[PDB]
């Protein structure tokens, strides 16, 4: 199925950099759609905007999962 | 958009916690250095090694309908 | 500032532990109302997990959300 | 304050000036030394004292007399008496330039070695109050984009001055090479930009801290008003700093003092409560509400800013000025982060200030107000200013700051001097070099980097006579090549076999783990 | 037990106690392994009967099952297998040493005196059966890697293993020298098909209907 994802763009691409356990991680992810189920970032209002042979504008959603490690002793 | 809190468990003992801070950006341009991300991971939590796992979701097929979808089954 | 922090944290820990005990006994319930505008849902495998959109490594996790507000009547 | 007397470490065990009713509880490893003793002809009822110990020198700010000594505090460099009370001080250009910020709003650039007020500028023409300070913090930092140039953050009651183009190295050159016309021309080229915090800090900014993390310049300002915290970062597309993060005055109404060691923003609130914060996103990491710390000072044997990262959480010994139940007496505690174990307790007068030291000082400096023994004078009235130096001359107290800050070179000599355990220094250096070996991978350009560390680790293991520690280090060593791993496991097995030939084969955990590692030695090669 | 010459019973007892850490340090443990391994090998001689070959396999298993086999003289056992005309069995014992430099020297000196095709045939016929199947492929990987490193593609080129020598170039990414040998010393068709298969394997397929010289040119430009 290598010919199926070499002709399609990924709906989400994620890189996860971690050390040892996956409790502490840094994630950089790019999604063509909104990856948030409780918020919606402002896409341009396609009313009175481009309605011709030109393609519609697309805003890619990039999300950065960071964290802060606290030592409990 | 999300605030996470995951405990660091060593031998089923709470030796720490991971306070996740998930941010989201809406920008047409996407470009970042992997070395910069690895350095940020090394310098923010003061760990030694870095390993990068890659994930990708390629949507192959979605059931199309002659109307906006309401039914959960798809 | 003293009781409203420590006592609240302990009460929240007790509510979470009660939710785990209910989940492990085979009884899945609605997201319990810890506060008026806050409800906490213990999403496990068998329930939809929004965090899978950003992190595939979270399977059994509490999601704290605002209570879904219903429309007002006259 | 004009009567200056400079005393050395040999004058400490021959006389003291202090107020009675002092109780000390703790180990005798802490030594209090009397370095500087400044007596005044008039006993100030409530002097507004301040002291800062920079690498360029030591500044004592009295009501109106500024005393500038060297970092050792044994020679008199400068003594300036002004008619306006000085609020903030700061040294620059190896201590050859003094910036005096008077209460009226005038900044004086004065050459230290010539006693000449080279420049005087009224940066603010409005004196808000002659009893409360106008300038709050004076932070001088070295520019990384221009050679011989400084950038300077002046926190004011209505905002902050970002002053760049401080080409003070060339000003000093034009002082040495005698041409004062060019010196004045360069002084007139200084670029000052005021950024107002009147839209976010409506009650005046209290404290300012500046750092360099995440390839940015996080300037955290803590004040009272609409927003307690304001995080300013320089805009790469413009000339100035913009707000990046805001914390509302809901939980914490403001910050009185900051201290940023590394990725740790120790925030003192308006309630004299210390807390631990992560500067990356300003999340609550720790809080210290039990200790009413009026002022906190963090002192450690600093060798490099990256030394704290790799050795846990013992980095700093918190010197906290706790307010005890006595309304005449403050209590200096030494705590071990974060367990708050009382390592040292000293009773200090009501007028006593922790010296605002940098991240380059190794000793603790305290400005103490000692009143002369006179029943006609109250204890609050300070007649003598005494510089108290807290030195942990006895071992196992400086050694804690030695082994943590990756200072094995000095720690070896420290252990030799007191006849301590030198092998433990090698044991810690072995773990550090073990992680340094993990600082490399299978690359076509890093071959020599890990190879030299292999020899360093071999030398350290040869210097460590404890066989079990060497075997465990070998078993837990992270290697990048199979050849080296096999060779070092063979060496570990051989060392265990050699010692068992004379002890009738004493069973040890090292041999049991080495054998099972060898069982997985060939399995990993054949499988992956 | 060895005093009564019960070599197989002693082997069974040793393998029964090969899971206890206390008995691994018996002074006779490694001594018992060595004689039990060698006595059936010393008694055996060419030609190899099925019982003698099974006993050689049992000795190799005892080498495998021994947790302290690194303390045994594996060069001696390998030379005993050489006297049995079993280069594959000798290389199996040579590979299991815990010393890396001596192992590399001995393997390089050994494989340069034995025909790789015969060793691979012995690996296929006997080493791929029983419990030795998983280690035969690793011996084969060592042999093929040494062949590629020694520019000895011509030994297996006339046999059926050359195509196999092709696919091992796929898995270990050691195709540069094989491609050079095929393009220079042999026909360009085998080099072009080899590079096409390599491109298909790595997810960067070369488009078809391409001349072998052009495919070689893109392969050479792909190595820079």
- Per the document, the length of chain E is 224
B2, B22, B55: residue with CB nearest C56? B55
Q: Please give the sequence-ordered ranges of beta strands (E in DSSP) within D73-226, or none if there are none.
A: 76-81, 86-92, 97-102, 106-111, 116-122, 135-142, 150-156, 159-166, 191-196, 205-210, 219-223
Which of E172, E122, E184, E117 has its CA nearest to residue E148?
A: E172
| Residue E95 main-chain phi, psi, to 5 deg | -70, -25
D280, D435, D438: residue with CB nearest B44? D280
> Touching check for A38 and chain C: CB below 8 Å?
yes
> Touching check for A35 and chain C: CB below 8 Å?
yes
Pure H helices in D52-178: 168-176
Separation between Cα atoms, residue D355 and residue E148, nearest integer Å: 71
- Minimal-distance CA residue of chain A relative to B60: A4
Running DSSP on this structure, what letter comes out for residue E196?
H
Q: Please give the sequence-ordered ranges of beta strands (E in DSSP) within D300-362, or none if there are none.
A: 317-323, 329-336, 341-349, 352-354
- 3-state DSSP: chain A helix, strand, coil percent, rounded to 5? 5, 40, 55
Residue D172 near residue D97, CB atoms below 8 Å: yes
Would you put residue D217 in left (φ > 0), alpha (ψ -120 to 50) or beta?
beta
Q: Do D507 and E134 touch (CB under 8 A)?
A: no
Distance of residue A64 Cα from the nearest chain D Cα, in angstroms: 13
| Residue D227 main-chain phi, psi, to 5 deg | -125, 130
Contacts of residue B57 in chain C, CB cutoff 8 Å?
Answer: none
Q: Do B46 and D309 touch (CB under 8 A)?
A: yes
Separation between Cα atoms, residue D50 and residue D64, nearest integer Å: 11
Separation between Cα atoms, residue A73 and residue A71, nearest integer Å: 6
Look at residue A70 and give its three-state secondary structure.
strand
- Minimal-distance CA residue of chain A relative to C65: A38
Q: Which two tokens stand for residue C27?
A: 């009884």
- Minimal-distance CA residue of chain A relative to D285: A70
Separation between Cα atoms, residue D410 and residue D391, nearest integer Å: 16
Separation between Cα atoms, residue D321 and residue D345, nearest integer Å: 10
Pure H helices in chain E: 7-16, 29-43, 50-65, 74-83, 87-95, 100-111, 116-122, 133-149, 153-157, 161-171, 175-184, 188-201, 212-222
Residues 35-54 of B with CB under 8 A from A: 37-38, 40-41, 44-54
Contacts of residue B48 in chain D, CB cutoff 8 Å?
Answer: 435, 438-439
Look at residue D135 and give its three-state secondary structure.
strand
If you write DSSP's letter for every residue of E11-51 in order, what string do you get?
Answer: HHHHHHTTT-TGGGG-TTHHHHHHHHHHHHHHH--SS--HH
Which of E177, E176, E170, E180 has its CA nearest to residue E203?
A: E170
Separation between Cα atoms, residue D42 and residue D220, nearest integer Å: 40
Separation between Cα atoms, residue D22 and residue D332, nearest integer Å: 12
- 3-state DSSP: chain D helix, strand, coil percent, rounded to 5? 25, 40, 40
Look at residue D145 and give its three-state secondary structure.
coil
Q: Please give the sequence-ordered ranges of beta strands (E in DSSP) within C13-72, or none if there are none.
A: 38-43, 61-66
How many of the other CB atoms lie within 10 Å of CB of C62? Answer: 15
Strand pairing category for D31-44 and D3-6: antiparallel
Diameter of chain D measured on Cα atoms:
90
Q: Do C50 and A37 touch (CB under 8 A)?
A: yes
Task: Write down the experimental method used for this entry.
Answer: cryo-EM
The distance from CA E110 to its chain's CA centroid, rounded to whole angstroms, is 12
Separation between Cα atoms, residue D150 and residue D92, nearest integer Å: 8
Look at residue A20 and give its three-state secondary structure.
coil
- Per the document, the length of chain A is 73
Look at residue B18 and give its three-state secondary structure.
strand
D280, D283, D439: residue with CB nearest B48? D439
CA angle B47–B52–B57, rounded 5-degree value: 140
Q: Do A68 and D281 touch (CB under 8 A)?
A: yes
Distance of residue C48 Cα from the nearest chain B Cα, in angstroms: 12
> Touching check for B56 and chain A: CB below 8 Å?
yes
Residue D35 near residue D7, CB atoms below 8 Å: yes
Which of D298, D316, D319, D318 has its CA nearest to residue D307?
A: D316
Distance of residue B71 Cα from the nearest chain A Cα, in angstroms: 18
Q: How many CB pairs under 8 A join D and E?
A: 34
Burial level of C50, CB count in 10 A (0-12/13-18/19+)?
middle
Instruction: Enumerate residues 6+ apart whose C-beta is below 8 A from B11.
Output: none
Separation between Cα atoms, residue E191 and residue E47, nearest integer Å: 41
Query: For D74-109, b where at least 16 C-beta lie within 10 A, e where not — what string?
Result: eeebbbbebebbbbbbbbbbebbbbbbbbbbbbbbb
Residue D52 near residue D387, CB atoms below 8 Å: no
Separation between Cα atoms, residue E26 and residue C27, nearest integer Å: 57
Q: Do E67 and D515 touch (CB under 8 A)?
A: yes
Strand partners, D342: D335
Contacts of residue A73 in chain D, CB cutoff 8 Å?
Answer: 313, 338-339
Enumerate residues preceding breaks in chain E (C to N > 2.5 Å): none
| Residue E188 main-chain phi, psi, to 5 deg | -75, -15
Q: Counting runs of H as helices and runs of E as strands, what totals does chain B give?
A: 1, 4
- Minimal-distance CA residue of chain E relative to D500: E25
> Touching check for D281 and chain B: CB below 8 Å?
yes
Kind plus residue range of the DSSP H or E element containing D255: strand D255-260
Separation between Cα atoms, residue C41 and residue C31, nearest integer Å: 4
Contacts of residue C53 in chain A, CB cutoff 8 Å?
Answer: 12, 31, 35-37
If you write DSSP's letter for every residue of D3-52 in order, what string do you get?
Answer: EEEE--GGGGGG-----S-----S-TT-EEEEEEEEEEEEEESS---EEE
Verify E-B touch: 3 or more CB pairs within 8 A: no
> Touching check for A37 and chain C: CB below 8 Å?
yes
Residue D103 near residue D134, CB atoms below 8 Å: yes
- Minimal-distance CA residue of chain D relative to B23: D281
> Nominal resolution in Å?
3.9
Running DSSP on this structure, what letter comes out for residue C71?
P
Q: How many CB pairs under 8 A join A and C?
A: 17
Contacts of residue A35 in chain C, CB cutoff 8 Å?
Answer: 53-54
Residue showing tokens 């006179």:
D374
Angle between helix axes D467-475 and D482-499 (nearest 10 degrees) is 160
Which of D26, D16, D8, D53 has its CA nearest to residue D394?
A: D26
- Minimal-distance CA residue of chain B relative to D437: B48
Mutate to test the interface with D, among E70, E94, E103, E145 (most CBs of D within 10 A): E70
Pure H helices in D342-446: 398-404, 408-418, 423-438
- Per the document, the length of chain B is 74
Separation between Cα atoms, residue E33 and residue E131, nearest integer Å: 19
* Interfacial residues of D (vs E; Cβ cutoff 8 Å): 483, 486-487, 489-490, 493, 500, 505, 507, 511-512, 515, 518-519, 521-522, 525-526
Separation between Cα atoms, residue D481 and residue E171, nearest integer Å: 19
| Residue E147 main-chain phi, psi, to 5 deg | -60, -45
Contacts of residue A37 in chain C, CB cutoff 8 Å?
Answer: 50, 53
Contacts of residue A25 in chain C, CB cutoff 8 Å?
Answer: 57
Look at residue D411 and give its three-state secondary structure.
helix
Separation between Cα atoms, residue D485 and residue D493, nearest integer Å: 12
Verify B-A touch: 3 or more CB pairs within 8 A: yes
Separation between Cα atoms, residue D435 and residue D429, nearest integer Å: 10
| Residue C7 main-chain phi, psi, to 5 deg | -65, -40
If you write DSSP's letter for every residue of D427-447 in order, what string do you get?
Answer: HHHHHHHHHHHHT--S-SS-H
Q: Do A73 and D338 touch (CB under 8 A)?
A: yes
Residue D35 near residue D69, CB atoms below 8 Å: no
Which of E212, E164, E162, E173 has its CA nearest to residue E191?
A: E212
CA angle D71–D75–D78, rounded 5-degree value: 90
Q: Do E21 and D483 touch (CB under 8 A)?
A: no
Distance of residue A5 Cα from the nearest chain D Cα, in angstroms: 28
Mutate to test the interface with D, among B42, B43, B45 (most CBs of D within 10 A): B43
| Residue E7 main-chain phi, psi, to 5 deg | -60, -50
Separation between Cα atoms, residue E90 and residue E107, nearest integer Å: 10
C-alpha distances (whole Å) from E109 to each of D206, E102, E146 are: 78, 10, 11
Q: Do D522 and E68 touch (CB under 8 A)?
A: no
Strand partners, D157: none
How many of the other CB atoms lie within 10 Å of CB of C12? Answer: 15
Verify B-D touch: 3 or more CB pairs within 8 A: yes
Verify D-A touch: 3 or more CB pairs within 8 A: yes
C-alpha distances (whole Å) from D518 to each of D408, D526, E67, E75 are: 33, 13, 8, 19
Separation between Cα atoms, residue E1 and residue E7, nearest integer Å: 8
Would you put residue E80 in left (φ > 0), alpha (ψ -120 to 50) or beta?
alpha
Residue D17 near residue D34, CB atoms below 8 Å: yes
């Amino acid at each position: 199925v290598k010919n199926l994802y070499q002709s399609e763009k990924p709906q989400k691409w994620r890189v996860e950099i971690y050390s040892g356990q996956k409790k502490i991680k840094t994630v950089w992810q790019l999604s063509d759609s909104s990856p948030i189920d409780h918020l919606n970032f402002h896409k341009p209002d396609f009313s009175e905007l481009t309605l011709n042979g030109s393609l519609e504008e697309r805003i890619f959603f990039t999300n950065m999962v960071t964290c802060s490690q606290v030592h409990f002793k | 958009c999300w605030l996470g809190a995951e405990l660091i468990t060593t031998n089923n003992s709470i030796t720490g916690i991971v306070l996740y801070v998930v941010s989201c950006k809406a920008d047409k341009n996407y470009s970042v250095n992997l070395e910069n991300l690895k350095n940020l991971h090394k310098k923010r939590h003061h760990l030694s090694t870095v390993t990068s796992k890659g994930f990708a979701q390629y949507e192959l097929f979605k059931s199309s309908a002659l109307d906006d979808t309401i039914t959960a089954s798809q | 500032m003293w009781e409203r922090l420590n006592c609240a944290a302990e009460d929240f820990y007790s509510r979470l532990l009660q939710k785990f005990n209910e989940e492990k006994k085979g009884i899945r319930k609605d997201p319990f109302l810890y506060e008026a505008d806050v409800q906490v849902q213990l999403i496990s495998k068998g329930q939809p997990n929004p965090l899978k959109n950003i992190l595939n490594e979270n399977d059994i996790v509490f999601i704290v959300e605002k209570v879904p507000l219903e429309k007002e009547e006259t | 304050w004009n009567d200056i007397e400079l005393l050395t470490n040999d004058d400490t065990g021959s006389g003291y000036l202090s107020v009675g009713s002092r109780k000390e509880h703790g180990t005798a490893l802490y030594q209090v030394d009397l370095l500087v003793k400044i007596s005044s002809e008039k006993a100030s009822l409530n002097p507004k004292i301040q002291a800062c110990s920079l690498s360029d020198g030591f500044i004592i700010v009295a009501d109106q007399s500024v005393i500038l000594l060297d970092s050792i505090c044994r020679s008199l460099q400068l003594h300036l008496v002004f008619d306006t009370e000085v609020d903030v001080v700061g040294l620059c250009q190896e201590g050859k330039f003094l910036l005096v910020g008077e209460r009226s709003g005038n900044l004086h650039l004065i050459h230290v070695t010539s006693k000449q007020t080279l420049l005087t500028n009224a940066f603010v023409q409005k004196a808000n109050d002659e009893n409360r300070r106008t300038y709050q913090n004076l932070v001088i930092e070295k520019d990384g984009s221009n050679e011989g140039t400084y950038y300077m953050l002046l926190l004011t009651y209505s905002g902050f001055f970002c002053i760049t183009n401080l080409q003070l190295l060339k000003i000093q050159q034009a002082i040495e090479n005698v041409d004062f016309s060019t010196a004045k021309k360069l002084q007139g080229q200084i670029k000052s930009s005021f950024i107002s915090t009147e839209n976010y800090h409506t009650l005046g900014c209290l404290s300012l801290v500046a750092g360099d993390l995440a390839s940015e310049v996080p300037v955290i300002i803590g004040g009272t008003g609409n927003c307690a915290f304001s995080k300013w970062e320089p805009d790469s597309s413009k000339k100035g700093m913009t707000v990046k993060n805001l914390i509302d005055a809901e939980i914490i109404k403001g910050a009185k003092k900051f201290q940023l060691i590394d990725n740790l923003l120790f925030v003192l609130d308006t309630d004299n409560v210390l807390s631990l914060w992560d500067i990356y996103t300003l999340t609550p990491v720790w809080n210290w509400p039990s200790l009413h710390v009026e002022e906190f000072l963090l002192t450690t044997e600093a060798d490099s800013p990256s030394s704290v990262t790799w050795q846990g959480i013992t980095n700093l010994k918190l010197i906290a000025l706790t307010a005890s139940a006595n309304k005449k007496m403050k209590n200096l505690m030494v705590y071990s982060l974060p367990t708050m174990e009382i390592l040292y307790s000293l009773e200090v007068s009501s007028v006593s200030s922790l010296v605002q030291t940098g991240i380059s000082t190794d000793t603790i400096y305290l400005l103490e107000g000692v009143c002369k023994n006179d029943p006609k004078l109250s204890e609050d009235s300070v007649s003598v200013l005494v510089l108290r130096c807290l030195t942990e001359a006895l071992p196992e107290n400086r050694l804690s700051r030695l082994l943590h800050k990756h200072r094995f070179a000095e720690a070896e000599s420290f252990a030799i001097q007191f006849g301590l355990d030198v092998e433990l220094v090698y044991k810690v250096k072995s773990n550090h070099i073990l992680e340094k070996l993990a600082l490399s991978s299978v690359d076509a350009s890093e071959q020599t980097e890990w190879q030299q560390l292999v020899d360093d680790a071999k030398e350290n293991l040869h210097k460590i006579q404890d066989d079990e520690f060497v075997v465990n280090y070998c078993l837990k060593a992270q290697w990048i090549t199979y050849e080296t791993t096999q060779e070092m496991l063979n060496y570990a097995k051989t060392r265990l076999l050699k010692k068992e030939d004379k002890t009738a084969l004493i069973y040890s955990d090292g041999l049991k783990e080495v054998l099972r590692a060898h069982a997985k030695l060939t399995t990993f090669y054949g499988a992956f | 037990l060895l005093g009564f010459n019960m070599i197989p019973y002693l082997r069974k007892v040793l393998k029964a106690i090969s899971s206890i850490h206390s008995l691994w340090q018996v002074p006779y443990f490694s001594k018992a392994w060595q004689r039990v391994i060698q006595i059936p090998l010393l008694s055996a001689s060419c030609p190899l009967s099925p019982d003698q070959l099974s006993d050689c396999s049992e000795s190799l298993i005892a080498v495998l099952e021994c947790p302290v086999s690194g303390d045994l003289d594996l060069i001696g056992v390998a030379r005993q297998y050489i006297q049995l005309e079993l280069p594959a069995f000798a290389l199996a014992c040579l590979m299991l040493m815990p010393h890396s430099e001596k192992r590399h020297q001995q393997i390089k000196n050994f494989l340069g005196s034995c025909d790789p095709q015969v060793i691979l045939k012995q690996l296929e016929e006997h080493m791929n059966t029983g419990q030795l199947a998983g280690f035969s492929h690793q011996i084969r990987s060592l042999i093929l890697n040494n062949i590629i490193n020694k520019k000895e593609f011509g030994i297996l080129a006339k046999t059926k293993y050359f195509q196999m020598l092709k696919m091992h170039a796929m898995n270990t990414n050691n195709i540069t020298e094989l491609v050079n040998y095929l393009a220079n010393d042999l026909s360009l068709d085998e080099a072009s098909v080899l590079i096409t298969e390599y491109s298909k394997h790595c997810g960067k397929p070369v488009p078809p209907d391409t001349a072998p010289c052009e495919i070689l040119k893109m392969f050479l430009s792909g190595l820079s």
